[PDB]
């Protein structure tokens, strides 16, 4: 196979459970698993199922989850229900459930399906049976070893990376959610076998971590990379730092597999976010990573203006497939959600970009200094 030049269309395996959209976090809660069903239905109506393999994930077992999470926390998640909450008030506080991370009907099953897609995708990659695996129900990057955080309960990303590490010496994690990928970075902070790269809003903003001076520790020193940003970053600003940083990371770290969290709360108009990317600017990140021709697990994450989440992950599936799709949306079960325009692509707002071009270049220059410290 010495003739390979690393191009070609890529084999894509996509994971989805038709039950996922029915899980409900509660009245007024911004996290809406329904957006995954909206994404699926939109990409079915564009015909993208003709171009990829579609799999229904298994329900990951408590035991699969305790490859990272503590036994006590997973036992709690398996046991807690809206009808027995009163008896668990102490454990709810200890594991940080019942505020941002509510108890809801089927919580554990939702975690099992989110996680099952990511671990199943990792196995498929390890078996060299696909180039890309996609799980838009995964990417729940804030969950910690023994606590929920940030609408995330089980860290499917950490579990998928642990699976990749069975066959890959070095794994690269890239996080374009507007929030810092703190749960993933914490899990791998002291190893060089996982490099974590997060771009995120930083300053009076959840979760409060991801300073560019957070670079890892011990054998993991220089293997955590954080790009802190201000409100209002736009396509042009993002694209001028993302490809140079990822290219330098690829050059210095030479990973053999990549996990890309595609949290869509970095889009213009997100309910919780303060960035100004379009779907095209967000998806340029997938294009950039895809060109390195490494085994790639693409995951979901945040995204709280759900019409735009469905647009984003539909277009990023098309990008993974190297399929052009029209801007005019096909009819679909959720067509009214996409008015008044009924187009796939979105316009940025007139919000001010507080990330000056000088700020962007200066942060990039500082991270390049840290990347020079790899062997």
């Amino acid at each position: 196979a010495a003739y390979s030049q690393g191009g070609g269309k890529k084999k894509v395996c996509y994971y989805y459970d038709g039950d996922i959209g029915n899980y409900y976090y509660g009245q007024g809660h911004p996290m809406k698993p329904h957006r995954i069903r909206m994404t699926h239905n939109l990409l079915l109506n564009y015909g993208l199922y003709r171009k990829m393999e579609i799999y229904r994930p298994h329900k990951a077992t408590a035991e699969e989850m305790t490859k990272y999470h503590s036994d006590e926390y997973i036992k709690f998640l398996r046991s807690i229900r809206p009808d027995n909450m009163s008896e668990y008030s102490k454990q709810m506080q200890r594991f940080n459930v019942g505020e941002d991370c509510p108890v809801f009907d089927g919580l554990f099953e939702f975690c099992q399906l989110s996680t099952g897609g990511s671990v199943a995708g990792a196995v498929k990659l390890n078996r060299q049976q696909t180039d890309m695996a996609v799980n838009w129900a995964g990417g729940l990057h804030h969950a910690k070893k023994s606590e929920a955080s940030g609408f995330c309960y089980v860290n499917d990303i950490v579990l998928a990376i642990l699976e990749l590490l069975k066959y890959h010496q070095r794994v690269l994690y890239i996080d374009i959610d507007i929030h810092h990928g703190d749960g993933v970075e914490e899990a791998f902070y002291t190893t060089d076998r996982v490099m974590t790269v997060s771009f995120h809003k930083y300053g009076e903003y959840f979760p409060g971590t991801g300073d560019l001076r957070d670079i890892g520790a011990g054998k993991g020193k220089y293997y955590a990379v954080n790009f802190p940003m201000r409100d209002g970053i736009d396509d042009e600003s993002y694209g001028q730092i993302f490809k140079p940083i990822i290219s330098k990371v690829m050059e210095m770290y030479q990973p053999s597999a990549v996990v890309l969290q595609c949290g869509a709360d970095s889009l213009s108009g997100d309910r919780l976010g303060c960035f100004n990317l379009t779907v095209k600017g967000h998806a340029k990140c997938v294009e950039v990573v895809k060109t390195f021709n490494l085994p790639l697990l693409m995951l979901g994450g945040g995204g709280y203006t759900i019409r735009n989440v469905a647009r984003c992950w539909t277009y990023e599936t098309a990008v993974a497939l190297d399929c052009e799709i029209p801007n005019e949306l096909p009819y679909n079960d959720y067509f009214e959600y996409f008015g008044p325009d009924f187009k796939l692509h979105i316009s940025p707002s007139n919000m001010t970009n507080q990330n000056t071009p000088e700020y962007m270049e200066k942060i990039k220059q500082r991270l390049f200094e840290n990347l020079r410290m790899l062997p």
Binding site: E99, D100, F151, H179, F206, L272
Partner: peptide, 8 residues
């Protein structure tokens, strides 16, 4: 991370 409620 919800501005409308809590500390996240």
């Amino acid at each position: 991370x919800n501005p409308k409620q809590x500390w996240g």
